[PDB]
Symmetry: D2
Subunit: 121 residues, 4 copies
């Protein structure tokens, strides 16, 4: 019934988001992996007037991995599309950049892919 | 966060206007020199508000959805990178641009690249 | 029983490969998608002495999309790992670069992910 | 293919020695300035042997597995990019470096980046 809701990726991370009428994404992310505990703030944007031809809805969001419990000195962005239907899905690719010195900046950024559904593990 | 807050440009001639809040928020507007884009677009992101002090960059990311009250490309970009302070401040990024597609075309939905931003003097 | 064999990705593309003893990958690729028909030459490398701790086997390969039938003026590289087991798998991330002018070089490279098994569709 | 064939360097100080064959093959050796690497490693790749003549680059890619008779990092890099000819010839790339990992650690297996190669004069 839309982007707003509670989503889970293939690792069991929990993505709770609200899609504002004019394109805002606002919520929290709890990661099952990495140097992370509890919830982290997220913010992003989505296409609030998608095509009407069967295409998905483009979107993206960011988390910086600092909260009251931990600071990993890193940030992830997810870029992807929402696909509506009986089992709604958000398919993404992500970039996780850690703060580095300039000379190790070559090993600063991990890449991967996450797919989200509203099915709770 | 004084360092990040300001006006920036990338190697394509795009410009990025941003304000870094005490809570880790990035807000502002983006004007792209390339692609299916005109005028300013809203951006929103996050940064590490308590970075290391050991000669590391400050991790940050932001998103633009390419819809404004003038044009809609049905697409969104995220930039992931780090701010490097000092007199010649830079934001070094890699980005992902996803277009809305049909399922059969999803394999060709996402472009990747890298942008370098240089800060300019208010 | 190893990297050598016939593999299929989630799109139904066919990847036929031989893993040489000292690290070569040599074979053909037939793509179910894009500006492609029939087989294309591939070449790559893999770790011919992987860790013995349960880790996967790192690898990569390239196809340039020119054969006797078509030339798309593009090339893909896949980077990933082989995971042995009862349903062996190769998990990859890929980059597809098209030849462009310098000023459109910003839109030259697509990214995605392919997972391969030996199960024929 | 005279253009591609030769010695190249990237912005990290790594060097790439390559021979472009008539059949579309790339062969050679790579010496990395960074990471868990020493001495030369085999590379192998492909390029478009009949590129456009319309002022486009020539698409190419190659792979190195980081095992040689001296060291083994249990990892591999692929570079995907284009050759831009002329007097100041360049190869502009983006790359993926995958390390062998356990299944539980596969989420952190792959680094991404970009390398610029400049040709040097035999
Ligand atoms: O370890 C660190 O630097 C901090 C935590 C990184 C967490 C990531 S990993 C990719 C993305 N998807 C997911 O479920 N979590 C995030
Ligand atoms: O055409 C579309 O879908 C909409 C416009 C995309 C713009 C992008 S391209 C990479 C990034 N860097 C920059 O200066 N602009 C953004
Ligand atoms: O259209 C073009 O430029 C030429 C053909 C590109 C084919 C690709 S798309 C990603 C990769 N995986 C797969 O099954 N095929 C390849
Ligand atoms: O540490 C390891 O796993 C083995 C060594 C990795 C080397 C890489 S890093 C990006 C690419 N560019 C370059 O000059 N070298 C390669």
């Amino acid at each position: 019934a839309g982007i707003t809701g509670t989503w889970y990726n293939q690792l069991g991370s929990t993505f709770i988001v609200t899609a504002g009428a004019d394109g805002a994404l606002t919520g929290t992310y709890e990661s099952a992996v990495g140097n992370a505990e509890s919830r982290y703030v997220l913010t992003g944007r989505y296409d609030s007037a998608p095509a009407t031809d069967g295409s998905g809805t483009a979107l993206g969001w960011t988390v910086a991995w600092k909260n009251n419990y931990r600071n990993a000195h890193s940030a992830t962005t997810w870029s992807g599309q929402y696909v509506g239907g009986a089992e709604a899905r958000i398919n993404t690719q992500w970039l996780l950049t850690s703060g580095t010195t300039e000379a190790n900046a070559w090993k600063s950024t991990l890449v991967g892919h996450d797919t989200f559904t509203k099915v709770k593990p």
